[PDB]
Symmetry: C5
Subunit: 69 residues, 5 copies
């Protein structure tokens, strides 16, 4: 799956339908995998750099693949 954005997590958002939104770089993306919610908030809190891989690389796009550096 192609890389889409790499950067620190600027903010995260819990959504009304239990999906989770993340802003990394200049894109706002969401995931429906509940396992990723605490992993991404820990990355945010400790300042890790994440790379999100997705074909829907646009605002509002979904993802499931994340690399944590």
């Amino acid at each position: 799956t192609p890389d889409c954005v790499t950067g620190k997590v600027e903010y995260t958002k819990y959504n009304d339908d239990d999906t989770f939104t993340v802003k990394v770089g200049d894109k706002e993306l969401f995931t429906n995998r509940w396992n990723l919610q605490s992993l991404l908030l820990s990355a945010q809190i400790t300042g890790m750099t994440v790379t999100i891989k997705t074909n829907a690389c646009h605002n509002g796009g979904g993802f499931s693949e994340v690399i944590f550096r």
Copy 2:
């Protein structure tokens, strides 16, 4: 959904029916989403600023949307 309060978490409370109460700004609100309980206690412990979005913006109102900054 409109913004209702933005601030640091002042305290959290675990309720008898397994919902979770939070006091942010001047409002005391609750959520029934179990996934938000450890995310909001981590935001409290590390001093993050949260924005709660809800139409029930009054004491005792419920919410499910939270932004973590």
Copy 3:
């Protein structure tokens, strides 16, 4: 529900029937809510002050309401 003890968590214990015991102040109390186990060990590790509310305010009493400050 009335306040029973306020203080820092002295120790926590995992019990043979999957309940969790906590010692706050001068009372040792237990809860059967599994969601409270990691929230109380985080409060212990980061030194938060907790208030437990319960009518069974005696050693061995149960509880479910906790305020985290």
Copy 4:
């Protein structure tokens, strides 16, 4: 249930059947309770002192009761 060992966690191990092994003091013991896995890794990472209570107090013995000081 009698005390068996008290000390800091030397290492933890994830086992092929999803049980979890811990070495505290001079004993290596395991638990089948999935709730204890992140509680024991947090105790190892932050250097807490744990007391394990079990009648199978020998290498390879199982336990479920742990006190976190």
Copy 5:
């Protein structure tokens, strides 16, 4: 099961089928056990040394046994 790599976690990756990849030493390996995902990210964030035991000791190989010191 034989030791395969020992080292600090260099990166972790959440995969599209909910498995989790880890790079330790010179090998990139994956596990399908959901319980290991937050244990390995905590090991990565706090700089623990992990030993992965597996017979598939090659890039792309799977594992389930991890020692955390």
